[PDB]
Design a binder for this molecule. Structure first.
Ligand code: MVS
Length: 378
């Protein structure tokens, strides 16, 4: 009862609940509650959707389309995606967010925490949980920024043999509406049933891309979500639609992180500790167990990038260690600077996709290539 009771309340603030779930990576049976909320189809009425459209794309917005699907295909973090076709026959996907979602952030976040605190299920983590939550939700609402990020990433991936970013339809974009070209295929959410051979090459290319986003582009998504990676079986390509929480970082800052991964693969615990303190992962005076919990959680990363043999991300053991790559918050109060939080969250979220898809492939070659390019720039 209390279960379905909580679920029903959290759906009224679905975006905040899910974003909070990402920050803690799914503990009690609250993981079920979050999953149920993730499956909940609490969509905003069409009237509301038509309001944001007419109030952003103009009263004659439907004059631009041959067809507008009234039933949403799926729910976004804050909006929902409706499929449509433009007057010329071009198939597109329109992500429409609701009016005032940005002004409802503080109220929704507080309602979320009130539900969780009252339920006495939260791990009861630190103040810092609200500040980061309101910050990430504000970023997702800025669809104009999201559009710009998508155009930039599309250029970075120009001519790539596996990844591509769908083009943006500026004619149908706005602060509350983001429209892209239709993509063929399905999100990796529904790719568990694919061949072990397909899933290994999908995840191999995702992890290589992860290394480039971190140490070559310096332009990465904070929380990777396999629901936003569409796999096209016909073309054997992956369409990238996960650019809602994108940020840039100084090459010097990401250079400290690659030194940590270097040391991790070299089993140099002291350098991992020293550079970790330099990045403010650690303050240097964390109790022995808190520091060892952070250094231990990193061993899994060094294990993969140091093995010239295939690394199995889907094992029960490795899977559990990959889900614990968020020790950055547990009993851990300047907080871990949001820049540091996002870098380790990009790496860990990438390993997570490899684990959920039960992927297995070598990882040493791709990192030595990434570290080589680093030394060249240096
Ligand atoms: C993750 O976020 C987004 C997801 C989508 N979904 C889609 C995009 C393109 N083709 C699709 C085809 C089908 C089919 N059958 C279903 C969904 C599609 C669109 C977005 O922007 C317009 C997003 O936001 C950036």
């Amino acid at each position: 009862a209390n279960a379905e009771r909580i679920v029903r309340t959290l759906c009224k603030v679905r975006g905040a609940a899910l974003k909070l779930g990402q920050m803690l990576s799914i503990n009690p049976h609250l993981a079920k509650i979050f999953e149920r909320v993730r499956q909940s189809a609490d969509f905003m009425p069409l009237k509301q959707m038509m309001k944001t459209l007419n109030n952003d794309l103009g009263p004659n917005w439907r004059d631009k389309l041959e067809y507008f699907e009234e039933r949403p295909f799926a729910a976004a973090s804050i909006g929902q995606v409706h499929l449509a076709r433009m007057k010329g026959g071009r198939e597109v996907a329109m992500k429409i967010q609701y009016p005032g979602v940005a002004q409802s952030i503080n109220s929704d976040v507080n309602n979320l925490m009130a539900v969780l605190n009252m339920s006495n299920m939260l791990p009861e983590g630190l103040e810092h949980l609200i500040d980061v939550l309101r910050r990430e939700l504000a970023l997702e609402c800025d669809y104009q920024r999201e559009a710009a990020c998508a155009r930039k990433f599309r250029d970075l991936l120009k001519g790539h043999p596996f990844f591509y970013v769908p083009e943006i339809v500026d004619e149908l974009c706005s602060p509350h509406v983001l429209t892209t070209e239709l993509v063929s295929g399905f999100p990796l959410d529904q790719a568990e049933g694919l061949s072990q051979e397909i899933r290994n090459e999908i995840c191999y290319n995702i992890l290589v891309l992860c290394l480039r986003e971190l140490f070559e582009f310096h332009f990465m998504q904070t929380d990777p979500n396999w629901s936003n990676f569409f796999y096209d079986p016909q073309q054997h390509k992956v369409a990238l639609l996960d650019f809602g929480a994108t940020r840039e970082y100084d090459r010097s800052f990401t250079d400290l992180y690659i030194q940590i991964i270097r040391a991790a693969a070299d089993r140099d615990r002291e350098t991992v500790r020293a550079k970790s303190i330099e990045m403010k992962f650690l303050t240097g005076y964390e109790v022995k167990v808190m520091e060892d919990a952070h250094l231990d959680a990193i061993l899994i990363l060094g294990e993969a990038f140091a093995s010239d043999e295939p690394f199995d991300f889907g094992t029960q053991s490795t899977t559990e260690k990959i889900h614990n790559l968020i020790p950055v918050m547990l009993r851990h109060r300047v907080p871990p600077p949001e820049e540091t939080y996002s870098l380790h969250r990009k790496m860990g979220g990438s390993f997570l996709i490899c684990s959920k898809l039960k992927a297995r492939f070598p990882c040493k070659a791709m990192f030595e290539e990434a570290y080589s390019n680093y030394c060249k720039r240096q």
